[PDB]
Amino acid sequence: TATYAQALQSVPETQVSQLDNGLRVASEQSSQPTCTVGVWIDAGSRYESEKNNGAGYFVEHLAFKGTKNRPGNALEKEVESMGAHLNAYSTREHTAYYIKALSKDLPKAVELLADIVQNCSLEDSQIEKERDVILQELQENDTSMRDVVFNYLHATAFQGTPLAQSVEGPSENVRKLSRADLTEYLSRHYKAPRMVLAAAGGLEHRQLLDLAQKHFSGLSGTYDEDAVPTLSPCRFTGSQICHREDGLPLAHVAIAVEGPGWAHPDNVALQVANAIIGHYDCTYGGGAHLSSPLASIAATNKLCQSFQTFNICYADTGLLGAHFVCDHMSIDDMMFVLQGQWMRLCTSATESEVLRGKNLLRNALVSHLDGTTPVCEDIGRSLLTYGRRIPLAEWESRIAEVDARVVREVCSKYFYDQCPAVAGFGPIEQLPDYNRIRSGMFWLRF
Amino acid sequence: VSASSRWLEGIRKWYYNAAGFNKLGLMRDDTIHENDDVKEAIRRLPENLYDDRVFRIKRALDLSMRQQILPKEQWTKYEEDKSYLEPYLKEVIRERKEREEWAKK
Amino acid sequence: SHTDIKVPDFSDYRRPEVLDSTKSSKESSEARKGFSYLVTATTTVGVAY
Amino acid sequence: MLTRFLGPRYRQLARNWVPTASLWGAVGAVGLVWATDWRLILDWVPYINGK
Amino acid sequence: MLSVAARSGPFAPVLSATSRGVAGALRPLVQAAVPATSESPVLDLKRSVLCRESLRG
Amino acid sequence: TNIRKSHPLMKIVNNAFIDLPAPSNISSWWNFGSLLGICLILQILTGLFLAMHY
Amino acid sequence: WALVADLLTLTWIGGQPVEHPYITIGQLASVLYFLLILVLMPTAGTIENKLLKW
Amino acid sequence: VPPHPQDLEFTRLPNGLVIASLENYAPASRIGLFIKAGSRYENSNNLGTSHLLRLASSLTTKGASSFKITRGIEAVGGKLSVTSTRENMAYTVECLRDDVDILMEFLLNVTTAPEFRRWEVAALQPQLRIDKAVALQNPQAHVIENLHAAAYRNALANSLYCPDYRIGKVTPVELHDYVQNHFTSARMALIGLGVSHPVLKQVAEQFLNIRGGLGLSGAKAKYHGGEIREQNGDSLVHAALVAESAAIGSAEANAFSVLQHVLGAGPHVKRGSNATSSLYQAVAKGVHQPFDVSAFNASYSDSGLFGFYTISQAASAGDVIKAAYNQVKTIAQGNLSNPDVQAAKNKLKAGYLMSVESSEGFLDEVGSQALAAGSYTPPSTVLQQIDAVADADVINAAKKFVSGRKSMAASGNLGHTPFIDEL
Amino acid sequence: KAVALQNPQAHVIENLHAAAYRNALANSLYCPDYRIGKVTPVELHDYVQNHFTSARMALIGLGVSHPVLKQVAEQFLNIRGGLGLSGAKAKYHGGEIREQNGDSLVHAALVAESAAIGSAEANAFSVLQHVLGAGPHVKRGSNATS
Numbered sequence A: 001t002a003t004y005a006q007a008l009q010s011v012p013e014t015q016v017s018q019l020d021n022g023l024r025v026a027s028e029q030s031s032q033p034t035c036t037v038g039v040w041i042d043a044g045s046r047y048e049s050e051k052n053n054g055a056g057y058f059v060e061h062l063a064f065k066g067t068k069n070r071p072g073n074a075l076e077k078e079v080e081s082m083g084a085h086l087n088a089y090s091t092r093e094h095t096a097y098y099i100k101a102l103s104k105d106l107p108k109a110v111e112l113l114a115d116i117v118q119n120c121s122l123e124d125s126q127i128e129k130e131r132d133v134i135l136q137e138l139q140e141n142d143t144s145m146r147d148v149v150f151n152y153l154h155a156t157a158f159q160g161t162p163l164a165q166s167v168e169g170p171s172e173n174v175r176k177l178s179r180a181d182l183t184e185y186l187s188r189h190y191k192a193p194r195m196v197l198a199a200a201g202g203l204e205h206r207q208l209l210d211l212a213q214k215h216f217s218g219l220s221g222t223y224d225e226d227a228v229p230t231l232s233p234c235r236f237t238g239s240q241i242c243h244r245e246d247g248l249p250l251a252h253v254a255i256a257v258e259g260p261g262w263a264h265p266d267n268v269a270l271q272v273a274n275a276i277i278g279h280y281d282c283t284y285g286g287g288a289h290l291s292s293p294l295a296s297i298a299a300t301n302k303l304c305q306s307f308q309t310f311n312i313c314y315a316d317t318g319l320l321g322a323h324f325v326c327d328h329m330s331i332d333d334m335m336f337v338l339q340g341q342w343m344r345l346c347t348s349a350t351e352s353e354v355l356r357g358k359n360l361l362r363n364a365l366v367s368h369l370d371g372t373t374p375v376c377e378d379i380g381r382s383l384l385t386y387g388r389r390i391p392l393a394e395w396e397s398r399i400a401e402v403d404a405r406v407v408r409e410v411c412s413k414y415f416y417d418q419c420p421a422v423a424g425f426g427p428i429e430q431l432p433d434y435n436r437i438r439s440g441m442f443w444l445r446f
Numbered sequence B: 001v002s003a004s005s006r007w008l009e010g011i012r013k014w015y016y017n018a019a020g021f022n023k024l025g026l027m028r029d030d031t032i033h034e035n036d037d038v039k040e041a042i043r044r045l046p047e048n049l050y051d052d053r054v055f056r057i058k059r060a061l062d063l064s065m066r067q068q069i070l071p072k073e074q075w076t077k078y079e080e081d082k083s084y085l086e087p088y089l090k091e092v093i094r095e096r097k098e099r100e101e102w103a104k105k
Numbered sequence C: 001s002h003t004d005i006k007v008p009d010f011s012d013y014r015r016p017e018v019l020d021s022t023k024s025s026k027e028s029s030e031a032r033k034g035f036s037y038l039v040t041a042t043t044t045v046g047v048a049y
Numbered sequence D: 001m002l003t004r005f006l007g008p009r010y011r012q013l014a015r016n017w018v019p020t021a022s023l024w025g026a027v028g029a030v031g032l033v034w035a036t037d038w039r040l041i042l043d044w045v046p047y048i049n050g051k
Numbered sequence E: 001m002l003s004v005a006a007r008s009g010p011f012a013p014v015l016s017a018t019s020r021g022v023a024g025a026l027r028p029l030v031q032a033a034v035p036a037t038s039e040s041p042v043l044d045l046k047r048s049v050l051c052r053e054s055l056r057g
Numbered sequence F: 001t002n003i004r005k006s007h008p009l010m011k012i013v014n015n016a017f018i019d020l021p022a023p024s025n026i027s028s029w030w031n032f033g034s035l036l037g038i039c040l041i042l043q044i045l046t047g048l049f050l051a052m053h054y
Numbered sequence G: 001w002a003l004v005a006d007l008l009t010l011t012w013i014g015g016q017p018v019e020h021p022y023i024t025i026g027q028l029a030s031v032l033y034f035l036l037i038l039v040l041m042p043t044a045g046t047i048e049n050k051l052l053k054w
Numbered sequence H: 001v002p003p004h005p006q007d008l009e010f011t012r013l014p015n016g017l018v019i020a021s022l023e024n025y026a027p028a029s030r031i032g033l034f035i036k037a038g039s040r041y042e043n044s045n046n047l048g049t050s051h052l053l054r055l056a057s058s059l060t061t062k063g064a065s066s067f068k069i070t071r072g073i074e075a076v077g078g079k080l081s082v083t084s085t086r087e088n089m090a091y092t093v094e095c096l097r098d099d100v101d102i103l104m105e106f107l108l109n110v111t112t113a114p115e116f117r118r119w120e121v122a123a124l125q126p127q128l129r130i131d132k133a134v135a136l137q138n139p140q141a142h143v144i145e146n147l148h149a150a151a152y153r154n155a156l157a158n159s160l161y162c163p164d165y166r167i168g169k170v171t172p173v174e175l176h177d178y179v180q181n182h183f184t185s186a187r188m189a190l191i192g193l194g195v196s197h198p199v200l201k202q203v204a205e206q207f208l209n210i211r212g213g214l215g216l217s218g219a220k221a222k223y224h225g226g227e228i229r230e231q232n233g234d235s236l237v238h239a240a241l242v243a244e245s246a247a248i249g250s251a252e253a254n255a256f257s258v259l260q261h262v263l264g265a266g267p268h269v270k271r272g273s274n275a276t277s278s279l280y281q282a283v284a285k286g287v288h289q290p291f292d293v294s295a296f297n298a299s300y301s302d303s304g305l306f307g308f309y310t311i312s313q314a315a316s317a318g319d320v321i322k323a324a325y326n327q328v329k330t331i332a333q334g335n336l337s338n339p340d341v342q343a344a345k346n347k348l349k350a351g352y353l354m355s356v357e358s359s360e361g362f363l364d365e366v367g368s369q370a371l372a373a374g375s376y377t378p379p380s381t382v383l384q385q386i387d388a389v390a391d392a393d394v395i396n397a398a399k400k401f402v403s404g405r406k407s408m409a410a411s412g413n414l415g416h417t418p419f420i421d422e423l
Numbered sequence I: 001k002a003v004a005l006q007n008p009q010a011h012v013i014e015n016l017h018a019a020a021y022r023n024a025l026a027n028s029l030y031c032p033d034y035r036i037g038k039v040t041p042v043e044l045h046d047y048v049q050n051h052f053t054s055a056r057m058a059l060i061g062l063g064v065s066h067p068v069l070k071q072v073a074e075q076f077l078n079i080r081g082g083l084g085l086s087g088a089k090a091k092y093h094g095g096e097i098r099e100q101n102g103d104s105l106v107h108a109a110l111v112a113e114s115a116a117i118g119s120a121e122a123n124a125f126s127v128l129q130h131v132l133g134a135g136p137h138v139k140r141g142s143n144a145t146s
């Protein structure tokens, strides 16, 4: 039978075309009877300013509530009535509207996405309606301790920069933000060079282009020339934010050093090292015998309820670390073990565990790209962030290169003797003093 | 089958009587040094064997305190001596040695 | 509403090379650790004497 | 009873901590050299032979 | 069209070695964070939702 | 409740020489620990009273 | 008890001058001490293991 | 320009074991052993045994120890996980394709070599408490659990989670006996993606020739109807209301499937008014605050439950419920447009095709198809059957809900939640 | 609650009432677990105000004299201004509540709506209770009369 090596080659060429526009239009054909189409805009919230902030989110909220061609209620009516799924997200860097549909519906799927992404009828009525909704979201988002701490870690690490901002913005902006503000953001940011039509499933690329030209005709056609700026680089602080609230039953900590961001070859190697540390959850099957020395000790000594390693990327920067959740008398021990892990991997990563991490990463990767929606999202995002789609085989190549040295090196570069950003929330009396955390970022023995 | 392996057996039965844990109602497995491997196998013992084990030791430490010994009747016959711990202890070491090989690669 | 939180401005306490919001802190990182560890190196050097 | 510690990983991990352990004896001896003013060694060092 | 499972109704639990415990199918959770103050159980003596083995390059 | 159990000092004494679980069972060969102690202070006391004149 | 008696032996030798039998017996007790402890007792322990089928 | 696809290959062994594979030429492989051993097969002397069993999937087997399963799998970035419904357990394993050998061996050891050691089992019983705790923090988990507890007397009445009184009480014998009684050949289906049917068949003929529990998918679930109510103070009242529908497979069951989509299941459009959701639109017409309604539709081997699931503020609970129920009653009375029925069909069909897109999803369909049907039934023919639904049958589906002895479960501040009785 | 709820009957008669009525007599003599820690001083205060009024009280004394009682009552127990009615009015509804124990012995009570206390019909039931048989009269007896 097919080797895994063979099996990577079999996965098709992501076909890319450029419109007379800026708009890139990209596709992976598969034999599916079903597709995901949509638009990845290079708008985010790194892109906004203090007065602007939370616009894109207010746009996302407005985006499906009716166009010039299809008023208020009726877009919904069309999508729903054809059994398709309309959806959106924005990040600090990326906005995406996408439809899950029947493949035979890729015509009207594209037709719709076009109408959405240009002809948003931002009716005054609605921007008003939306402001109460968006405020409620803020009130409920305040209850997700995890959602909070990552907003805090962003708020402290990037301290000064647009990246420090939340995607929703502050309460006050939401209440003051006008239609003028919104259309200004819209007309600045929703230009064809800064957006990709992405599709995955049961379609020829030829049809996708035909439809790109048809319905994305003249976006940046005569446009572009005036006051498009590139992103500023974002200063990392490394610094601490401690919001102490003993009324909450468990502590969330999220610790990070500075990442290199999207482009950098080091991401692969860091992701391996991350994979080795891994994640835990109290519902994990079989605890003591877990490979990961963190996760093992965590489970045996009941040192938390959850952890997760991470590497968030932005342009030219990012947050690399871990976040956990635990009892008020665990915050220290959990901190010790996580930190001592990082350092072990910096200094004395053995050969064996790195092969595990490498496999874990391969398994994550293939498994992640499962079916139209993931693959489409990865087409769209990738073209924004790499200017290509990077083929699975290339990732295998990039993974295969890494071994223990490539770990100890790339870990030491990012982790060793570096100021972290700490964010902390809830019953956080025992969260180690910052000096003592920062002491944890190097061994005296080494 | 054998005159001579009945002799190694007679040497063994000698040393058994000579050791003289029997004399305080003890069994060979009552007398084992508690290390981690041993400690766990006591953990793994079923309720009755555990309760029987604690009583044997309790009776013996009592005698040992009063510097006495059982009636010869009440001593533990070499043949009547059950290695109730053996299989557990073996399974523990077996599991540990696995973890130890895995730690090597 | 936890989105109302900004971290207070810090320029007033910040080292000179960590002041531009647009400037990466990675450049100054080596120098800043360099200075402060040389401050502790020389102290030990003095105590050792 | 140290059979335990003989395998591929252990040799990787020793090979990892070797340049460090090298330097730690460099630290330790040169400190003893300086602290005793070892005469025998220090004659070799330019500047420091102050006689 | 079997799998009861995603007939989108009755419950399916998942346990795993690697991955956090799931609870399954359908019912409103859903058109229901849309009109709002669904305040959420977000990390109290708890698991974590989303779940991982879902990273990237 | 008992002063002997909770007073920061008396605590130490009680945990060592009052409420401390010893074996039912240890014999005269265990007496040497304490007699070593008794030896150390007897040596300290006479040793002192000697140092006053030496 | 071979160890105890051997140590008594060495006490007694320590107590006599460095002359005829005293020398050889003293060298022997010296060898015996380091034999009993270093080689003889570990082996004896192991034999009793094999005696208890252990 | 990808591979012209392989077909699924599907084989019934004479012992009644079922093998299906697909060679998608994928870098990863999925293997499921799908057993007829879901929770309905517990009796009142051993409730919870299948939930402990769900958790016990990395305890020591005969020639693969606990430690090795964890390390062996983790070493290859493998996953091993076990999912129960009321009818099935589904032991599925995933990895890179070169690694099917190591993963398969682990899988068969779990499902056919469980040692269930006293001390490992005892060590595990606290985990039913954690596991239940986590799951039972979606108000729906409780509701649908009580909903089943109230509908049936027997079998489907049993909970997917262990009763609190049994936590600490389920035994190694009870575990052992559950495997023996339920994990036999006639009761199993071995499904593989990115493996070849010759290998699957070999594995099956070698290792999965087991039989001598029981035959029947069958105590036979006695529908009874009733209501279970649970005073919360949760501020939002969750409630589900339900009548006996149709057993999965039958033509009538697709009528209900479509009726579900008429009345309306989940949302399609992020933060949408659900213009196409009749239940949502009928309730909105009366009700001016936060709510949710969705048509509820569960379907089992030998029964099913249909109705709807409401979430409202405590005071509106009744208003929501009565609005919802009428709206069904209105379809039973015959007020149902052909383009409505058509819309729900495109909603259902697309949802199906959507549901089988990913490996995890496809494998699950095929697993359960195998156990409920003894077949595979391609999309082309599922949609055909969907298309085959008459406007009338859907009316009649709704007629059946309206006229049929009911089952209710609700939890919250129940002071303005109705009583069946009162609907 | 813990102490009381260790007679299987306590639970049963509690659930029995919970199942019979929709309202009022459905409520439990013991606090719901979800309310433990949650009942407030205001709720307490309000309960006394609403319910501990004159129209709602009876002062009974043994080995005291009626003049004193009356004085105490006219001085100290002139309170009114909750509500009147012994009355939400208890809506009988019927149903069943079942609780899987493993207790080895099944306790069960089965019941229909009888008669309100006071009424003539209520004494019919009182007597019917004694026909069918209440407790034992004779220590370790076969209850020949039950």
Ligand SMILES: COC1=C(OC)C(=O)C(C/C=C(\C)CCC=C(C)C)=C(C)C1=O
Residues within 6 Å of the ligand: F016, F017, F021, F022, F023, F026, F030, F031, F033, F034, F036, F037, F038, F040
């Ligand atoms: C169960 O074991 C123990 C004994 O019984 C065998 C003792 O008799 C003593 C008595 C110790 C004394 C008198 C301490 C004297 C020493 C100093 C340095 C003040 C201790 C602590 C002990 O643990």
